[PDB]
Subunit: 102 residues, 5 copies
């Protein structure tokens, strides 16, 4: 139906992060070079994001699911909604929503 | 619909049974106040996925996550045992139904 | 149906061979009375997947779960070695069959 | 790859294991019964192999990938090439190559 | 082609960019001389996938393995940042391109 769930929006708006709706991810990147170490995605229009990571339970779970959502979007063409931080370049994903429809 | 087995299992607890749910969104959030894994149905119902750190529930909760994603990716229906006290309601058990099975 | 190897392995045990099974439900449940992973076949039969915390059976039981979901998602048939000592019967071994690979 | 990559063949041929090429895996088996405890694969010809396992890094990674390769071959009917030891029965897979058709 | 982000990241290292690679083979090997994970391209190129025991690179290396498999399985193409200091060349970064998203 397009558009993040109201739940997802409400959650994002109570933070400093920015809602990004209806993104098509077309690249998934793994990098271990010491300066650019991380997991990233790139959208059809060139937007770049870094995926959050955590070693500890329970965020080690959510961040692993963020990766699975990112890769499934890339393989499937499914769109995502993102709650993303403007602190850095690239912006960091703090929440992500995979949509069958909206 | 849900297997009798899954219905009976839910009925032993304080939770309620939700049947034939079509999940359309799968959310991962690490924001400090909404930290969790969540799903949203085609009608806007929201649920949190149980989590657990230690054996053996770490297995069961991982499988709930896999079931939820599969549901969203394929449009397969699920049946849920969910606590009504919490909002969003917590999934205590979940049943994935194969495409073209019973409902 | 079942490889001769799988059959022969099952026949070495007190367990029962179940051949040609279409799994149509996959259940994850963390309620404490019915804690576990289960599958339901198109005939309505219910089985519990084995679990193990330690190496190496933690590998095999992980793989049983992957076989179970793969079967539910795809309609591929499984053969099971299941113990009738409890209900639901516990899967001690499982074999996933490629589509159009015999019976 | 109308066959195993020259790399995979060269690597196998320096060991005591033997090369099995172009195999169609039709069954994937998980077993925790006391004397047949293991992961196995069965080919369209009735050949049975045991997948290696390892508890420690780095071979926990390689054996985990062996299992992914084996299931993916069974689901997809993509063929595999195996480097397998005859020191046991079933023969133990020491290396495996998933190959796209062609 | 690779994203500009990916290219700029590769240009700050000693490695070289390889663009638009079709991976046709995925190898897991525990033989004592050639122990590793490798991929092979449609042209016969061989690369070794990086690995790492500990956080955070155990995440990134696990994802390289997932990207590799998904490429071979589905024929989606990859861009790679590969060091020529070893033989086979080692992958230090990899970019998975969506089907129908062009070069």
């Amino acid at each position: 139906g397009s558009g993040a769930s109201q739940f997802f929006k409400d959650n994002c708006n109570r933070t400093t992060a920015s809602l990004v709706e209806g993104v098509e991810l077309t690249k998934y990147i793994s990098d271990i070079n010491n300066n650019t170490d991380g997991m990233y995605v790139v959208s059809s229009t060139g937007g770049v994001w870094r995926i959050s990571r955590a070693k500890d339970y329970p965020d080690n779970v959510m961040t692993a699911e963020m990766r699975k959502i990112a890769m499934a979007a890339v393989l499937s063409g499914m769109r995502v909604n993102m709650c993303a931080s403007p602190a850095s370049s690239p912006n960091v994903i703090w929440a992500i929503e995979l949509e069958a429809e909206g």
